[PDB]
Design a protein around this nucleic acid. Structure first.
Ligand SMILES: Nc1nc2c(ncn2[C@@H]2O[C@H](COP(=O)(O)OP(=O)(O)O)[C@@H](O)[C@H]2O)c(=O)[nH]1
Length: 320
RNA sequence: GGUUUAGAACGUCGUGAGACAGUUCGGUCCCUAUCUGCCGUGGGCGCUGGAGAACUGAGGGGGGCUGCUCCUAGUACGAGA
């Protein structure tokens, strides 16, 4: 029946300011509002193939409905940022849009392939202008044009990409002394933040010991889910660099339809648990038409995400 | 071609001949350049013995126009556009 298990489902939005990189990263994704899916097994053929539902958005203030009418259909948000500008007024807009629907955000600081590109500065820019509290998942290696890869704060390796074929044949590297000290600094500032998921993690670290990356990734995913933090990654979609690890972070922190509480509905008016519903293949059918389109071919075409239920080709439905 | 000749007509003016910054159709435009000027082109003598050539260069003239496309570069600027 179901081709991919619900747990292997990511509903991600790519929203940012204008020309921040959205469509470029989406093309790099298709290689490695416009809704489109993909099957990204993993970076090392790990993570048996996930089905990532990507809703590429506009970033213009003119088309703000075209992103707000997808935000409350999405389950996660991949907020893109440029590395020379970072937070723009347009970035503040879609940010407030996502805060209105309480989306668990990660961030992707694109355009590290430009002059004046920074990563620390843009992280702090996010922390000061918007209000978010970001945990840097990556850290750039190569300032503006020397940008070759990043260091992780979980694997402690360098994913320096191979620039012979576009961005697919990356290598794992020895995280050399180019930056191998700030790496430690922010790795520790990441552990200290993932400790912020349970008292039993305070007692875990406060023993003077660094816990394991498995239960650090689980803890940080819990934090993204409760919207407690935001995980920022670092890439360059135009120089075919950094995109696959942002996809990894999407797999590892963004929510599946079951990694959240149920969707609360209404039976006939506001009741106690009127029609709270959970994403399941056995529920009564329920969806939400988040977008109407005008088919060039037909003139009518309705987008919808099924929250609870399973509909069929021909099934009657109720415009509740 | 127009404008202002001699023909003819219209409207109007006048009794009329005729007339009208009124109109209309028709209606002959000559000169072999002496001088200056200019464009070329030579003859004489001169430049101090005659000749053949190669130059220097005072000075004079000619020439000086610009579009579009691509690159720098979707770079600077610009929240964006
Ligand atoms: N230098 C550089 N240019 C990029 C990068 N990513 C995208 N671009 C350029 O941005 C231009 C338009 O961006 P676009 O994909 O439309 O993003 P949008 O503003 O969200 O629509 C393209 O011609 C790309 O070359 C990058 O990482 N570095």
């Amino acid at each position: 029946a179901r081709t991919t298990p619900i747990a292997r489902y990511r509903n991600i939005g790519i929203s940012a300011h204008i020309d921040a990189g959205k469509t470029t990263t989406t093309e790099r994704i298709l290689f490695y509002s416009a809704a489109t899916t993909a099957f990204w097994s993993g970076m090392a053929k790990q993570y048996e193939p996930h089905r990532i539902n990507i809703i590429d958005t506009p970033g213009h203030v003119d088309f703000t409905i075209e992103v707000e009418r997808s935000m409350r259909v999405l389950d996660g948000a991949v907020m893109v940022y440029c590395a020379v500008g970072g937070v723009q007024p347009q970035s503040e807009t879609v940010w407030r849009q996502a805060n209105k629907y309480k989306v668990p955000r990660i961030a992707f600081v694109n355009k590290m392939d430009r002059m004046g590109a920074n990563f620390l500065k843009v992280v702090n820019q996010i922390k000061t202008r918007l209000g978010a509290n970001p945990v840097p998942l990556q850290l750039a290696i190569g300032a503006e044009e020397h940008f070759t890869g990043v260091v992780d704060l979980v694997k402690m390796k360098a994913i320096n990409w191979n620039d012979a074929d576009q961005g697919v044949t990356f290598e794992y590297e020895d995280i050399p002394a180019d930056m191998v000290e700030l790496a430690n600094e922010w790795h520790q500032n990441l552990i200290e933040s993932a400790a912020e998921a349970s008292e039993e993690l305070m007692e875990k670290y406060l023993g003077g010991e660094e816990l394991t990356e498995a239960e650090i990734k689980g803890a940080l995913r819990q934090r993204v889910l409760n919207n407690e933090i935001i995980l920022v990654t670092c890439g360059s979609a135009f120089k075919n660099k950094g995109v696959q690890a942002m996809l990894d972070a999407v797999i590892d922190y963004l929510p599946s339809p079951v990694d959240v509480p149920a969707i609360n509905g209404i039976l006939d008016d506001g009741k106690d648990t009127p029609a709270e519903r959970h994403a399941s293949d056995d529920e009564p059918f329920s969806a939400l038409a988040f977008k109407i389109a005008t088919d060039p071919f037909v003139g009518n075409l309705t987008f919808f995400r099924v929250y609870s239920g399973v509909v069929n080709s021909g099934d009657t439905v109720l415009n509740s």
